[PDB]
Amino acid sequence: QAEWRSWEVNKRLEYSLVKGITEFIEQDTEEARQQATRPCEVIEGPLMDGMNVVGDLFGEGKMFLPQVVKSARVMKQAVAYLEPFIEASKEQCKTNGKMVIATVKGDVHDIGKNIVGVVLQCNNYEIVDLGVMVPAEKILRTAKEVNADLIGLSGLITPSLDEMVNVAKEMERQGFTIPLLIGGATTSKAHTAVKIEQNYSGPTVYVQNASRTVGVVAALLSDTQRDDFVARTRKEYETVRIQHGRKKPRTPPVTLEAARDNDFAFDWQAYTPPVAHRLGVQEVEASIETLRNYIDWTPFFMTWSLAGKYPRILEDEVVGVEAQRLFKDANDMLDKLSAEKTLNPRGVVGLFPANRVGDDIEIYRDETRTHVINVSHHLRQQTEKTGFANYCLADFVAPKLSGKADYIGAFAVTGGLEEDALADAFEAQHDDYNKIMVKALADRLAEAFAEYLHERVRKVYWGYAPNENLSNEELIRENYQGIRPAPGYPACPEHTEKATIWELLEVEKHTGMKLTESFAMWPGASVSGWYFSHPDSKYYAVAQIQRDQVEDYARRKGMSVTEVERWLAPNLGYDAD
Numbered sequence: 001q002a003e004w005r006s007w008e009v010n011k012r013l014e015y016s017l018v019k020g021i022t023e024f025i026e027q028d029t030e031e032a033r034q035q036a037t038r039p040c041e042v043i044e045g046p047l048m049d050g051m052n053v054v055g056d057l058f059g060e061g062k063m064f065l066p067q068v069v070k071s072a073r074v075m076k077q078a079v080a081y082l083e084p085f086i087e088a089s090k091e092q093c094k095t096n097g098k099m100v101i102a103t104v105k106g107d108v109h110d111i112g113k114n115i116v117g118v119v120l121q122c123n124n125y126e127i128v129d130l131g132v133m134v135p136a137e138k139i140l141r142t143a144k145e146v147n148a149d150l151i152g153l154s155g156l157i158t159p160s161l162d163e164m165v166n167v168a169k170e171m172e173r174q175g176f177t178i179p180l181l182i183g184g185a186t187t188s189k190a191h192t193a194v195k196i197e198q199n200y201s202g203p204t205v206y207v208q209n210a211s212r213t214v215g216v217v218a219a220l221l222s223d224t225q226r227d228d229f230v231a232r233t234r235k236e237y238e239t240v241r242i243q244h245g246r247k248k249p250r251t252p253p254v255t256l257e258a259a260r261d262n263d264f265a266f267d268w269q270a271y272t273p274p275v276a277h278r279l280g281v282q283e284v285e286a287s288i289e290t291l292r293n294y295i296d297w298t299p300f301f302m303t304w305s306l307a308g309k310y311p312r313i314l315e316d317e318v319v320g321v322e323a324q325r326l327f328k329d330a331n332d333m334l335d336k337l338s339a340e341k342t343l344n345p346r347g348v349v350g351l352f353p354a355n356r357v358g359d360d361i362e363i364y365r366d367e368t369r370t371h372v373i374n375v376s377h378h379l380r381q382q383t384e385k386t387g388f389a390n391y392c393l394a395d396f397v398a399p400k401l402s403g404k405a406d407y408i409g410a411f412a413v414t415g416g417l418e419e420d421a422l423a424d425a426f427e428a429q430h431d432d433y434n435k436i437m438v439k440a441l442a443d444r445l446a447e448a449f450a451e452y453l454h455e456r457v458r459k460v461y462w463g464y465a466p467n468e469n470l471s472n473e474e475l476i477r478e479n480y481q482g483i484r485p486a487p488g489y490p491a492c493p494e495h496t497e498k499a500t501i502w503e504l505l506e507v508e509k510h511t512g513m514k515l516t517e518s519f520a521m522w523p524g525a526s527v528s529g530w531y532f533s534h535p536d537s538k539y540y541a542v543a544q545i546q547r548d549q550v551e552d553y554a555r556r557k558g559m560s561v562t563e564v565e566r567w568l569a570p571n572l573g574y575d576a577d
């Protein structure tokens with residue numbers, strides 16, 4: 001008594017894949033198995049026909065990524081049922097190719113890699129996901145032992161670019177021949193071609209998103225396009241290299257001393273910085289009930305590869321129905337996590353007396369301002385400026401010689417320490433929809449905590465806007481006085497300053513969050529940065545700084561110039577090697 005239950009098993013398998021239905025997967029697979037001679041006949045035939053249809057529908061724009069992920073779920077359950085029969089048998093299963101994929105050493109975030117992997121498993125590629133913070137040695141060893149046809153590397157932050165070049169170079173040094181696949185939030189085609197590709201004599205390919213990867217992989221594993229595609233990419237990377245190659249209409253640079261002379265022009269003697277209602281460090285927690293109202297749903301839809309802005313995405317004529325069901329799944333997950341207390345957002349916040357000296361911010365033990373407990377270092381824009389200041393974030397804090405009492409805040413927050421454990425539980429159950437869901441929700445929780453806690457700080461701990469009453473949308477549009485710049489962003493690009501935040505707040509002690517050696521944070525779903533209250537403070541890109549700033553910055557930090565050049569590679573107005 002159900003139309004599709006009445007079709008031949010092979011059409012049932014397809015319908016159940018396409019529709020993401022799991023209830024009859026074992027029995028339909030058990031039936032298909034009997035229908036065939038070798039167990040693997042089931043995967044190679046109806047199961048991949050299913051994924052054949054799924055792929056064409058996605059191609060046509062009749063399914064989107066959340067549904068493709070739900071199909072992958074029915075597929076991995078069929079296979080999980082079959083594995084006993086396949087193993088306890090002769091044959092062992094024809095695939096379209098095998099990839100080893102990893103998040104690079106020092107890097108923690110894996111949502112994007114997760115999605116690239118899932119998508120490739122739906123095209124009958126075997127994927128060996130080595131997880132995160134993966135050492136180059138681990139990656140090359142695994143690809144040998146397993147005989148991978150490709151290696152793919154994901155990275156979120158700037159230091160991961162270095163790790164990727166380091167992986168390329170080790171591949172050359174061991175004489176690897178297979179394609180190296182490059183993607184992730186920090187990666188770009190320009191950086192692949194100029195810095196990575198020349199280090200390896202196998203093909204190096206930047207790939208923008210999961211969807212494009214499928215065609216790249218196929219072009220690379222085909223005996224009639226491989227060569228055509230490789231040539232073409234190389235010819236592309238050569239072009240990219242000669243294009244950027246002569247440093248395209250660059251603004252003129254300035255001496256560090258001329259930059260500092262054109263600092264933010266302000267009248268400190270007429271101003272009275274708002275006085276922090278509270279000073280010191282406090283650990284904090286916020287329930288999922290509190291934090292859900294502060295969620296910015298747009299990057300979440302964006303992560304599930306549904307374009308559009310929330311609430312309107314829900315009405316969109318194309319993705320609206322799927323945006324609604326994605327959102328309903330997300331809210332049901334939040335309701336369980338929140339009722340059962342299995343993901344517990346947490347952070348630490350602090351406010352300190354402080355004052356600018358030069359391009360840094362001095363931070364004091366108490367309001368006598370006579371013992372300096374730490375220093376926040378910053379960079380100054382070093383291009384030539386017409387009218388405007390060559391900004392530096394320190395500029396927004398009362399110079400010490402003004403005699404004005406100023407303050408600085410820091411925070412580190414996480415959507416919850418359980419994130420990895422919850423994710424493994426779903427990985428263990430072959431459930432990629434919920435694995436990517438909880439990780440993407442944990443991230444919505446970290447950011448919601450960062451908005452919420454910033455608001456608590458404007459209104460209460462620092463307390464210079466206790467009557468602010470801003471809707472979620474006005475929060476997203478940043479209609480409030482003050483900023484919460486986060487190390488890594490172009491406005492404070494030096495990632496190692498997170499050490500300062502970790503020092504000032506004792507983050508790891510108070511909340512359990514850790515810094516990797518690239519200064520990524522663990523858990524993946526974490527945000528830390530600073531608080532400034534000045535009303536003219538903004539997120540001005542630091543951009544392109546010179547040797548003279550690198551050297552002076554090297555001195556302030558007790559680092560060698562080369563260590564600094566490495567941490568600031570994307571901001572150097574000169575070629576360091």
Ligand code: B12
Binds near residue numbers: 115152153155186446
């Ligand atoms: C949402 C977001 C986050 C989230 C989650 C990040 C994420 N993975 O998306 C959280 C809130 C967790 C995060 C935190 C921070 N982030 Co943030 N984040 C953003 C934001 C707004 C969007 C990221 C996004 O597009 N995700 C979409 C997912 C689906 O895509 P993806 O990860 O890019 O991968 C896709 C493709 O890259 C490709 N792909 C991915 N990997 C691979 C691998 C292979 C082999 C292939 C073929 C393809 C491929 O397929 C994937 C899906 O199709 C951007 C700004 C921006 N507009 O991009 C920054 C941004 C990436 N993050 C940034 C930084 C600095 C931070 C923080 C360090 C800030 C801080 N807190 O001090 C922290 C670090 C967190 C940590 N270390 O644990 C900077 C990083 C760049 C840099 N180093 O300067 C960015 C670029 C913002 C900026 N303006 O600079 N942020």
